[PDB]
Design an enzyme around this catalytic site. Structure first.
Site, PDB file in Angstrom:
ATOM      1  N   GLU C  68       0.773  -1.407   0.098  1.00 25.36           N
ATOM      2  CA  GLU C  68      -0.152  -0.051  -0.040  1.00 25.36           C
ATOM      3  C   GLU C  68       0.741   1.376   0.124  1.00 25.36           C
ATOM      4  O   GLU C  68       0.439   2.175   0.746  1.00 25.36           O
ATOM      5  CB  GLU C  68      -0.953  -0.029   1.244  1.00 25.36           C
ATOM      6  N   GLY C  69       1.921   1.413  -0.831  1.00 22.94           N
ATOM      7  CA  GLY C  69       2.890   2.122  -0.900  1.00 22.94           C
ATOM      8  C   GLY C  69       2.276   3.580  -1.015  1.00 22.94           C
ATOM      9  O   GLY C  69       2.827   4.801  -0.627  1.00 22.94           O
ATOM     10  N   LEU C 145      -9.855   7.106   1.611  1.00 19.27           N
ATOM     11  CA  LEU C 145     -10.971   6.684   1.946  1.00 19.27           C
ATOM     12  C   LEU C 145     -10.981   4.977   2.047  1.00 19.27           C
ATOM     13  O   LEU C 145     -11.064   4.476   0.720  1.00 19.27           O
ATOM     14  CB  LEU C 145     -12.170   7.077   1.338  1.00 19.27           C
ATOM     15  N   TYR C 152     -15.436   0.414  -3.499  1.00 18.56           N
ATOM     16  CA  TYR C 152     -14.737   0.507  -5.079  1.00 18.56           C
ATOM     17  C   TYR C 152     -15.090  -0.618  -5.909  1.00 18.56           C
ATOM     18  O   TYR C 152     -15.130  -1.702  -5.256  1.00 18.56           O
ATOM     19  CB  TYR C 152     -13.259   0.507  -4.568  1.00 18.56           C
ATOM     20  N   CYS C 156     -12.995  -1.157 -16.620  1.00 16.99           N
ATOM     21  CA  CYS C 156     -12.395  -1.054 -17.876  1.00 16.99           C
ATOM     22  C   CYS C 156     -12.525   0.381 -18.225  1.00 16.99           C
ATOM     23  O   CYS C 156     -13.266   1.313 -17.470  1.00 16.99           O
ATOM     24  CB  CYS C 156     -12.748  -2.004 -19.059  1.00 16.99           C
TER      25      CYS C 156
HETATM   26  C1  LIG Z   1      -8.449   4.252  -5.688  1.00 19.24           C
HETATM   27  C2  LIG Z   1      -8.446   4.709  -3.850  1.00 19.24           C
HETATM   28  C3  LIG Z   1      -8.430   3.595  -3.233  1.00 19.24           C
HETATM   29  N1  LIG Z   1      -8.081   3.743  -1.832  1.00 19.24           N
HETATM   30  C4  LIG Z   1      -7.916   2.727  -1.074  1.00 19.24           C
HETATM   31  C5  LIG Z   1      -9.040   1.745  -0.931  1.00 19.24           C
HETATM   32  C6  LIG Z   1      -8.195   0.569  -0.205  1.00 19.24           C
HETATM   33  O1  LIG Z   1      -8.281   0.916   1.401  1.00 19.24           O
HETATM   34  C7  LIG Z   1      -6.727   0.984  -0.780  1.00 19.24           C
HETATM   35  C8  LIG Z   1      -6.456   0.002  -1.694  1.00 19.24           C
HETATM   36  O2  LIG Z   1      -6.138  -1.264  -1.355  1.00 19.24           O
HETATM   37  O3  LIG Z   1      -6.941   2.293  -1.063  1.00 19.24           O
HETATM   38  C9  LIG Z   1      -8.046   5.329  -1.590  1.00 19.24           C
HETATM   39  O4  LIG Z   1      -7.996   5.476  -0.389  1.00 19.24           O
HETATM   40  N2  LIG Z   1      -8.151   6.164  -2.425  1.00 19.24           N
HETATM   41  C10 LIG Z   1      -8.371   5.940  -3.843  1.00 19.24           C
HETATM   42  O5  LIG Z   1      -8.446   6.911  -4.394  1.00 19.24           O
HETATM   43 ZN   LIG Z   2     -16.219  -2.906 -18.293  1.00 15.57          ZN
END
Ligand SMILES: Cc1cn([C@H]2C[C@H](O)[C@@H](CO)O2)c(=O)[nH]c1=O
Ligand SMILES: [Zn+2]
Ligand SMILES: C[C@@H]1CN([C@H]2C[C@H](O)[C@@H](COP(=O)(O)O)O2)C(=O)NC1=O
Ligand SMILES: C[C@@H]1CN([C@H]2C[C@H](O)[C@@H](COP(=O)(O)O)O2)C(=O)NC1=O
Ligand SMILES: Cc1cn([C@H]2C[C@H](O)[C@@H](CO)O2)c(=O)[nH]c1=O
Ligand SMILES: [Zn+2]
Ligand SMILES: [Zn+2]
Ligand SMILES: [Zn+2]
Lengths: 168, 168, 166, 166
Positions: C68-69, C145, C152, C156
């Protein structure tokens, strides 16, 4: 040295020779000596055209990198590549893995098992123009396994086009 | 159509343009129309040399595949590529991700996030001749970020050679 | 000696599974591996909210893996410092946020990496195409978030556009 | 519609971890996955000693994954039949045996595959190079000999040669 065998496979029109030469050019920028072996019946560094690899003699020992194009045409290619890589050469081979009937070139099979690296490139389906193509379809009547030619005699196709055309 | 953005990055001497043209040639075998945009100050399909992408006008709409070489020189490249891929084009870009100080070209950064595919090629270290190289070292005095040239002004190097040379 | 490998791609592409695949390979050759995750014999694991909180522990290991870099604010510099000391550093991260805008620090890593692989997912909207983007499914305008498939989905390109309309 | 993906490489390269990474991706898009292993909601698992013993169960799924492909004697044909019916077929297998000789059936799969990736391991002898070969460490001349790091190690080309001498 650290010898190795890298293998580039895939059907026709996938740019295997272009990838091979991309790799050679990288080595040439680091001043490595590169030797390119092509197949004799086939139609700017050190190169030779031969019908088998035994005809290269020991000339290959003068180079860091040996590139073999159209590997499926050489009957003794696995053994050549292993001999060279045991001497510390970087050996790069492009070859068809499959013939127009989707049967393997046996010698290229051997190379897969002896290779440090194996990449299989794809082409674009020349029949439907919509899918990645992994097979070569021969478009002329002939049953010679070996039949040298280009887009005048072959096309690369996706799995379902290969079937369709086979039926018609 | 199904538009997309493919990005090829890596340092100089890694064969990025060669990979780009390998891909174009694949599409050309399936009869796709391909347009190649090069950078104007830079020193056999439809092509143009421009200093920015806005100068291409709407000519790009006549093709299935748009290839952009030396993407880091075009200030409006991310937006161009997104506009084209939203219209259903396959857009293929080669570019330096990093300048000679190992700092990013910001616009190429944007493309990474917008790309369906991202490959980073390596070169061979032109200093030690023993390692993969991911960086470009400038060999001439200059502090212009943009400085067009070849092996007369640059070399690709591995991580530890880049450090060593920086010290000397 | 040292190297930085970067694994990017949208959510649900298996970046962390790939990172661990690589760690495992190194463990079979008896290399010591130190795994750093985010939170708000041969192995060793740690959860931290930034990389300064690891101190100099990382120097005891051959391989450092960072997951989670994109949540760590000093990741670029950390990875460079470690690779300059001869570590193999492997990082998984989102390259793009839910608005397809880049995480700036992960950008810096792209330029400093020996290797960069961008994994794809499968489109969770159409179920028919490779997905390279992460669509947020809940109204919010906080960049960060934390959440999962409730909040989420990976999509595509054209499903991202479609959903953005409706 | 259908496809065959092949994952090859020596032991300790993580082929099965890669196969499962891919399966997982498909599961996030609600594809049904059927996993076949060898033995002497969305998922389903089975152990079998050949692929004939699966019968027609496989037709109920979108994705078929086959692990340890080199132990199945009718794998090539099975994968072709399944991909012709529109399945995504994913196979992990050794390409080479401990003598660096090919598994003939995995050869046939290379020619029929849409995708072929050969993973590497890290040399378990020198601990310094990518490894592409599997060295057996116990005297035997049975081709098939089930086991783990006690009986096998993955090695780079030159360590394979060295060990073969002593
Ligand atoms: C795409 C995106 C994922 N995330 C998070 C969802 C998950 O906790 C993590 C991805 O493994 O990062 C965000 O905080 N902001 C973002 O814009
Ligand atoms: Zn699609
Ligand atoms: C598929 C082929 C191709 N060929 C030939 C056609 C071309 O001359 C050559 C392949 O060209 P390539 O170098 O791989 O771009 O192999 C056969 O002889 N038998 C087959 O079954
Ligand atoms: C590293 C570079 C390169 N360049 C130039 C040199 C070359 O003309 C061009 C890159 O060539 P390439 O197409 O990637 O093979 O970019 C810069 O202007 N600034 C830099 O920092
Ligand atoms: C390399 C090799 C592995 N194996 C085994 C070891 C493991 O049981 C399995 C690899 O996961 O296959 C053989 O049976 N023969 C071989 O030649
Ligand atoms: Zn087709
Ligand atoms: Zn170097
Ligand atoms: Zn070794």
């Amino acid at each position: 040295a650290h010898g190795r065998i890298e293998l580039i496979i895939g059907p026709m029109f996938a740019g295997k020779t272009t990838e091979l030469m991309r790799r050679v050019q990288r080595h040439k920028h680091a001043q490595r000596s590169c030797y390119i072996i092509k197949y004799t019946g086939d139609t700017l560094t050190a190169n030779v055209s031969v019908s088998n690899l035994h005809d290269v003699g020991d000339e290959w020992r003068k180079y860091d990198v040996i590139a073999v194009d159209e590997g499926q045409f050489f009957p003794d290619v696995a053994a050549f590549c292993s001999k060279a890589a045991d001497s510390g050469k970087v050996v790069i081979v492009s070859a068809l893995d499959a013939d127009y009937l989707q049967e393997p070139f046996e010698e290229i099979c051997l190379l897969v098992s002896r290779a440090d690296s194996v990449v299989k490139l794809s082409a674009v389906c020349m029949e439907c123009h919509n899918r990645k193509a992994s097979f070569t379809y021969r478009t002329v009547k002939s049953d010679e396994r070996k039949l040298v030619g280009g887009s005048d005699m072959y096309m690369s196709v996706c799995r379902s086009c290969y079937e369709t055309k086979r039926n018609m």
